[PDB]
Amino acid sequence: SVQIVYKPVDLSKVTSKCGSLGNIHHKPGGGQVEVKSEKLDFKDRVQSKIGSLDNITHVPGGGNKKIETHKLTFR
Amino acid sequence: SVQIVYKPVDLSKVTSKCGSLGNIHHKPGGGQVEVKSEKLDFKDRVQSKIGSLDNITHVPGGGNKKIETHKLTFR
Amino acid sequence: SVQIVYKPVDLSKVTSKCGSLGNIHHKPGGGQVEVKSEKLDFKDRVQSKIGSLDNITHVPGGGNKKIETHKLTFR
Amino acid sequence: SVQIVYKPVDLSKVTSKCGSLGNIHHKPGGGQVEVKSEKLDFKDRVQSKIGSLDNITHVPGGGNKKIETHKLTFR
Amino acid sequence: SVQIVYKPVDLSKVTSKCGSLGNIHHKPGGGQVEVKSEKLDFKDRVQSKIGSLDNITHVPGGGNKKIETHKLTFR
């Protein structure tokens, strides 16, 4: 009596073409950093970062993404 | 009596063509940073970032995205 | 009575073509960092980072991603 | 009696600065070449070139030129 | 009586700076070449070139030139 036929068909394409990719320059924190501290009181947790941190250069030739989710729930 | 026929057909395409990609310059925090502190009281948690942080250069040749979601719920 | 036929068909493609990929320059923390501290009191945990930390250059020729999830739940 | 004092002083400079140089594409003779010849008479020297010849891509980072000529003639 | 003092002084400079140089593509003679010949008479010297010949890609990092000529003639 209860017939379920789940037939998803996918013939798709995610495509990229690039003749040339390059000459990328990333220069963070060229300038001068000066931190002068006198008579500081801390009564709890301290987190400090000084300088050039967590800087990213990401250059994928493709960088193509496909996300697909299939869910069948029967109750 | 209860017949369900789930037939999604997909023949689609997400496409990019680029003849050339380049000569990208990213220069964050060229200037001078000076932090002078005198007589500071902190009675709770402190988080400090000084300089050039979390700067991103992202250059994908494609960068093409396809998101697809299929959900069948029977109750 | 309860017949479930789960037939997902996938003939898809995630593709990239790059003629050339290169000449990438990443120079974080070129500048001068000076940290001068006098008479500091800390009554709890301290975390300190000074200089050039956690800097990333990521250059994949492809960098193509496919995520697929299939879930069948019967109850 | 005849005194000649030839003192040319040169402190000059020819200078170039280029942040990035690239992504140059040179595609000569992409099309189709068809040469059909019937019943030709030549009674003297023949020179023939067919296709893609003498094509130049010249990409100097500098390409700076200085020409200097000094001539002293006494008679 | 006849005194000649030839003192050329040269402190000059020809200089180039290039941050990056690249991603150069040279594709001559991609197309199709077809040469069909029937009943040709040649009564003198023949020179023939067919296809992709004498194609140049020249990419110097510097490519800086200085030409200097000094001539003293006495008669």
DSSP characters over chain D: -EEEEE--EE--EEEEEES-EEEEEE----S-EEEEEEEEEE-S-EEEEEEEES-EEE--S---EEEEEEEEEE-
Q: What's the sign of the alpha-carbon dihedral D43, D44, D45, D50? A: negative
d(CA A14, CA C16): 9
User: Residue D67: which residues within 8 A CB-CB, separation 6 or more?
Assistant: E67
d(CA A74, CA B3): 13
Helix (H, G, I), strand (E, B) or coil at A75: coil
Structure determination method: cryo-EM
d(CA B71, CA B73): 6
- Tell me how close the Cα of C3 comes to any Cα of chain A, in angstroms: 5
Rg (CA), chain D: 26
d(CA E70, CA B7): 87
d(CA E13, CA D66): 9
Task: Say whether C23 and E23 touch across the interface (CB within 8 A).
Answer: yes
Number of H helices, E strands in chain C: 0, 8
If you ran DSSP here, which 8-state letter would residue C21 be given?
A: E
Task: Say whether E20 and C20 touch across the interface (CB within 8 A).
Answer: no
- SS3 string, chain E, reads CEEEEECCEECCEEEEEECCEEEEEECCCCCCEEEEEEEEEECCCEEEEEEEECCEEECCCCCCEEEEEEEEEEC
d(CA E59, CA E56): 10
Mutate to test the interface with E, among D5, D39, D57 (most CBs of E within 10 A): D57
d(CA B37, CA B48): 13
Task: Say whether E23 and A21 touch across the interface (CB within 8 A).
Answer: yes
- Chain A residues whose CB is inside 8 A of the C53 CB are 49, 51-54
User: Residue E43: which residues within 8 A CB-CB, separation 6 or more?
Assistant: D42, D43, D44
d(CA C57, CA A75): 49
> Residue E62's CB: how many other CB atoms inside 10 A?
15
Amino acid at D47: Q
Are C52 and C29 in contact by the 8 Å Cβ rule? The answer is yes
In the complex, which subunits touch B with 3 or more CB pairs below 8 angstroms?
A: A, C, D
If you ran DSSP here, which 8-state letter would residue C8 be given?
A: -
The residue of chain E with its CA nearest to that of A24 is E20
Burial E27-36 (b: 16+ CB within 10 A, else e): bbbeeebeee
d(CA B11, CA A11): 5
Query: Residue A74 pairs with which residues in a beta bridge?
Result: B74, C74
> Residue B63's CB: how many other CB atoms inside 10 A?
16
Helix (H, G, I), strand (E, B) or coil at C7: coil
Give the residue carrying structure tokens 């005198």. Answer: B38
In this structure, what token pair is assigned to residue D28? 């000569």
From the number of C-beta atoms within 10 Å of its C-beta (0-12, 13-18, 19+), residue A59 rates as: buried
Task: Say whether D20 and B23 touch across the interface (CB within 8 A).
Answer: yes
Task: Say whether C33 and B51 touch across the interface (CB within 8 A).
Answer: yes
Query: Residue B49 pairs with which residues in a beta bridge?
Result: A49
In this structure, what token pair is assigned to residue D59? 């990409």
Are E11 and D12 in contact by the 8 Å Cβ rule? The answer is no
d(CA A12, CA D62): 48
User: Residue A27: which residues within 8 A CB-CB, separation 6 or more?
Assistant: B25, B26, B27, B30, C25, C27, C28, C30
d(CA B64, CA A63): 7
